[PDB]
C-alpha cells in the first residue's frame, strides 16, 4: 500500500484518510483551520489533514 | 474518628481541629447524602458519600489550613459502629494524603 516515509521537516504534521470511512470533503475542509480547534496539535507545528 | 449511631437521619456536632463543625447524614433513595456546615455557616448541601474519596471537594471549602473527612467504605446506617467509620484529618496530614492519592 506504500506510506510517506519522510514527512520531511521538524514540526510538520499531516493526516491520511482512506476511502472506507467515506468521510465527506466538507469535514476535511473545515477541520484544517485553527479557528475551530478540533484537532490535536503541538508547539512549533503546522498541521494538514491530507 | 467521629462517633455515629444507627439511625436513618441524624446530625452530630463537634469541635475538632480548632473549628466548629456540624454534619448531617440521611438516606436518600439509594445512597447516602451529607450536609456540612462550619461556624454556623453552611458549606455544602447533599454531598454523596463514597468510600475513599473526601467529602469536601473544593479548595475554597476544605482548607487554607482546615481539615477534611473521608469514609473508609460506602455508608450504610445499619452498620455504623460496626465496620464503617468517619475520620477527620487536620491540614498537614490531609495534604499529605492528597499527595499520596496520585
Amino acid at each position: 500500500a506504500y506510506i510517506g516515509l519522510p514527512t520531511s521537516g521538524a514540526f510538520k504534521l499531516e493526516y491520511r484518510v482512506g476511502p472506507a470511512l467515506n468521510l465527506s470533503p466538507q469535514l476535511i475542509n473545515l477541520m484544517n483551520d485553527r479557528a475551530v480547534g478540533i484537532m490535536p496539535t503541538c508547539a512549533g507545528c503546522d498541521v494538514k489533514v491530507i | 474518628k467521629i462517633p455515629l449511631t444507627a439511625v436513618p437521619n441524624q446530625a452530630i456536632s463537634f469541635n475538632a481541629g480548632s473549628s466548629y463543625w456540624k454534619i448531617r447524614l440521611y438516606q436518600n433513595m439509594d445512597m447516602m447524602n451529607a450536609d456540612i456546615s462550619r461556624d454556623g455557616v453552611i458549606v455544602c448541601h447533599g454531598v454523596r458519600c463514597f468510600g475513599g474519596i473526601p467529602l469536601l471537594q473544593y479548595s475554597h471549602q476544605y482548607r487554607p489550613d482546615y481539615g477534611n473527612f473521608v469514609f473508609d467504605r460506602d455508608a450504610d446506617w445499619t452498620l455504623f459502629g460496626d465496620g464503617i467509620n468517619l475520620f477527620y484529618l487536620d491540614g498537614a496530614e490531609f495534604a499529605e494524603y492528597q499527595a499520596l492519592a496520585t
Binding site: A10, G44, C45 | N28, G46
Partner: protein
C-alpha cells in the same frame, strides 16, 4: 404558597416528609375549609397522601442527580464521563465451552441443566440435551452459574445430580476453552483508570522518558538531556538542530526490546532522537533499534537511543588499624556496595556521575567507624586497559555525561600501614 426554593447556590435541600405532609394538609385546608377531615379512610385524605408521595419523590429524584459531571458519581452517568476519554462496561460473560466427554450407557438421554463439579468444588451446568452412541462417548456443552472468569482444573469431574447409569464427566484438551470477562471494572477502579490516565498525560517528555525507561526491569539509571541549540550545551549533540538525547544505563538489559517499547510510548510528535557526533555513547545498533511495530493497530516506525561508555576506576587507601580489628575484604565490599548504590541517601556511580576519594572515605566512615584513614586516592581509565602507573592517581576525577564508572573487588587495593 407552601412551595419552597430548595435549590440554592449551595446545593439542593431535601426536606422531611412530616414537613411536606403538613404543607400539603395546609394547602387542602385552604382549598376546601378550615375544618375538613383528612384521614386515611376519607377520599380527600387519599388525595393528600398521593400528592405528598409525588412531591417528596420528585424532590428526591431531582436531588440525587444534582451534581453528576463531577467524577464522584456512579451508575451509568459516571460511565459516560469515563468513556468521554476511554472505558468499557458490561463485561459479564461466562466460560461456555465445547467438546466435553461423556461415557455413559447405550442409547440414553442426559437431561438438561445437569450439575457438574470439579476438584475445588465449583458448580457447572450442562447446556444441550444429547443422546449417547453405543460406543460410549459423546460431547456436551458446559456453563457455570456465576458470571465469573472461572478456570476449570483439568481433572475428571464429579457428578452432583445423577442421571441413570451415566458416569465419569471427564476432561479433554480438545475442548474449546473460552476465557470470559467477569464484571471486571464496577465503580472504583474506573476512578483509578482516570487517575492513571491523568498521571500519564501530565508529564512532559523529560519526565515521561525518565519514568518510562525507569519502569523497564533490571534498569539502573537513565540520563536524558535536550540540546535546545545546534551547539554544544552539555554534550556535543550537533547531529540535528533540535534532537532529544537519551542515555540508558543498565546491569545487562535482559530485555533489549523493552526499552525501545518504552521510548515509543513517550514520543512528542514533533522531535527527532538522533544525537551525538560519533563521540558520545555507542548506540546498541547503528541505524535503528528495530522496534515492535505498534501495540495498537499501527504500522512500523523507528526510534534511536544510546548507552554510556563503560569505564573502570582504581582506588588506593592507606589505613591504620587503630584500637580494633577490621577486615580488608570487608572494606573492599563496603566500597563496592557504595559504588552500586545500595546505601540509602546516596544514589551512587550513575551515568554521568563522577567519583572522588572523599566520597569513598565517607562510605568507609559510615560503614565502619573506629578506623583511622591516612590517605585515599582515586583514578580512572578506559575499560580493559592494563593497570596504570602510580602517577595516574588524583584526588578527584571528572566524567563525561555519556560515561559510567565501575569498581570491582580485586580492583581495590588496601595497605595496612
Amino acid at each position: 404558597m407552601a412551595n419552597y426554593n430548595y435549590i440554592v447556590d449551595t446545593g439542593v435541600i431535601v426536606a422531611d416528609t412530616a414537613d411536606v405532609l403538613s404543607d400539603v394538609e395546609a394547602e387542602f385546608r385552604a382549598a376546601l375549609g378550615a375544618n375538613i377531615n383528612l384521614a386515611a379512610s376519607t377520599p380527600q385524605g387519599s388525595l393528600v397522601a398521593a400528592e405528598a408521595i409525588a412531591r417528596s419523590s420528585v424532590m428526591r429524584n431531582e436531588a440525587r442527580i444534582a451534581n453528576t459531571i463531577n467524577p464522584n458519581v456512579s451508575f451509568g452517568t459516571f460511565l459516560d464521563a469515563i468513556c468521554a476519554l476511554m472505558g468499557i462496561e458490561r463485561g459479564s460473560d461466562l466460560s461456555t465451552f465445547g467438546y466435553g466427554v461423556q461415557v455413559t450407557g447405550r442409547s440414553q438421554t442426559r437431561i438438561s441443566t445437569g450439575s457438574r463439579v470439579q476438584t475445588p468444588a465449583g458448580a457447572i451446568f450442562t447446556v444441550m440435551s444429547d443422546v449417547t452412541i453405543p460406543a460410549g462417548g459423546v460431547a456436551t456443552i458446559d456453563i457455570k452459574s456465576q458470571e465469573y472468569g472461572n478456570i476449570p482444573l483439568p481433572v475428571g469431574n464429579l457428578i452432583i445430580i445423577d442421571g441413570t447409569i451415566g458416569w465419569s464427566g471427564a476432561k479433554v484438551i480438545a475442548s474449546t476453552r473460552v476465557d470470559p470477562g467477569s464484571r471486571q471494572m464496577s465503580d472504583a477502579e474506573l476512578k483509578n483508570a482516570r487517575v492513571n490516565r491523568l498521571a500519564i498525560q501530565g508529564r512532559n517528555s523529560t519526565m515521561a522518558i525518565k519514568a518510562y525507561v525507569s519502569a523497564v526491569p533490571n534498569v539502573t539509571s537513565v540520563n536524558v538531556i535536550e540540546n535546545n541549540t545546534g551547539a554544544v550545551q552539555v554534550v556535543n549533540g550537533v547531529s540535528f538542530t533540535l534532537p532529544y538525547a537519551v542515555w540508558v544505563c543498565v546491569a545487562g538489559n535482559p530485555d533489549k526490546q523493552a526499552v525501545a517499547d518504552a521510548l515509543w510510548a513517550a514520543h512528542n510528535g514533533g522531535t527527532p532522537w538522533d544525537y551525538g557526533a560519533t563521540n558520545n555513547g555507542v548506540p546498541v545498533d547503528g541505524p535503528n533499534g528495530v522496534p515492535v511495530r505498534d501495540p495498537a493497530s499501527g504500522r512500523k516506525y523507528v526510534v534511536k537511543w544510546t548507552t554510556p561508555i563503560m569505564y573502570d576506576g582504581y582506588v588506593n587507601v592507606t589505613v591504620q588499624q587503630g584500637s580494633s580489628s577490621v577486615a580488608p575484604e570487608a572494606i573492599q565490599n563496603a566500597v563496592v556496595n557504595y559504588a552500586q548504590g545500595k546505601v540509602e541517601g546516596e544514589e551512587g556511580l550513575v551515568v554521568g556521575a563522577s567519583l572522588s576519594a572523599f566520597e569513598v572515605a565517607g562510605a568507609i566512615a559510615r560503614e565502619i567507624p573506629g578506623i583511622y584513614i591516612k590517605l585515599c586516592q582515586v583514578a580512572c581509565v578506559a575499560a580493559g586497559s592494563p593497570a596504570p602507573a602510580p602517577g595516574d592517581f588524583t584526588s578527584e576525577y571528572v566524567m563525561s555525561a555519556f560515561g559510567q564508572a565501575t569498581i570491582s573487588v580485586g580492583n581495590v587495593r588496601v595497605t595496612f600501614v
